């Protein structure tokens, strides 16, 4: 058994992320499971624990921050989210690849947390398109062009979403990519004999 | 910028094979590193397609000027990649696609690491000169980027368009394309 990878998707708001993860999903060649988050609120109808969230009581998620096992956390409308760093770790010592599409502000959280992680950052089609174009619009199209530039440093990929079946095949392409690098496949080979 | 893209691996592995599909599928964007060489034309071959055909003491200045990127002598004929027509491409924006033995692969590692060295590995190494031919390609995969099996030849085409695409997806490469179109 490989170990798996953390593969992160991550862009800003309105750039596709949530299109890109459900086809990601849908494409028959891949085999990513989805990152399951804990939450201290109760189960809805229909709701299974280790199936649909990890429930837990306040104290066992707040246990989990303290120690450092909490991948990305917040807390929305006194109800704690976040992803656990033992159920992550488990999957991927198991050889599952686990794949989280998360907002740019905890993609730094899961970053800092585990810089292991394959982080893709998912890019507005527009922003190769710039200058193909002072106002006070014109002057913030340039401003969030410049961030964004400087966000994708922190990551490992840019890949642009033109079309959703391209970037789901650049994702593809790039989550085999990472399996075929010597320092894994070495391993690999090494264990089998 | 181009990427160098270099494939390399055991002699009988497939190399051959797998750079001629890589040729052949529609969606290659690289262009083939002709090598030079001192032998002469095989039935078939073209001067400038599949062969530098030039003479030995062509070959043997280039080499005491400096001209060479790697070479080598094979029972009195030289092979070898001219340095100015890969370093002519990569700054024109061509990627450059290189087949060549793992002599020559770890000559072209030493003089220019920024490229992508690939091992196209044998299958049987998943399935006592056998054993030590193993662990022999196992160490010299150390020195690689990727190691690609050729179980099926489509397969370790398609993972080699997989890894040239993805290089060129890295932040590193996307932020200088961006920055200079910035200003
Ligand atoms: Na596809």
Redesign the interface.
């Given at each position: 058994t490989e170990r798996g990878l953390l593969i992160v998707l991550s862009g800003p708001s309105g750039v596709g992320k949530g299109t890109v993860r459900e086809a990601v999903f849908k494409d028959p060649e891949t085999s990513f499971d989805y990152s399951i988050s804990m939450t201290t609120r109760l189960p809805r109808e229909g709701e299974q624990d280790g199936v649909d969230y990890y429930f837990r009581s306040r104290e066992v998620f707040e246990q989990a921050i303290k120690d450092g096992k909490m991948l990305e956390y917040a807390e929305y409308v006194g109800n704690y989210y976040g992803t656990p760093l033992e159920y992550v770790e488990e999957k991927l010592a198991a050889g599952v690849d686990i794949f989280l599409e998360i907002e740019v502000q905890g993609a730094m959280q899961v970053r800092k947390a585990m810089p292991e992680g394959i982080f893709i950052?998912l890019?507005p089609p527009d922003?190769?398109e710039?200058?193909n174009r002072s106002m006070e619009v014109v002057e913030e199209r340039?401003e969030t062009?410049?961030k964004e530039?400087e966000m994708?440093?922190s990551?490992?990929?840019?890949?642009v979403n033109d079309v959703v079946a391209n970037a789901v095949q650049?994702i593809?392409?790039?989550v085999?990519?990472?399996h075929?690098?010597?320092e894994r496949?070495?391993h690999r080979?090494?264990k089998?004999?």
């Open positions: 950052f890019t922003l190769s710039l200058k340039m062009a410049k530039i994708m440093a990551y490992d990929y840019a890949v650049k593809k392409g790039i085999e990519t990472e075929l690098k010597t496949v070495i080979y090494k089998m004999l």
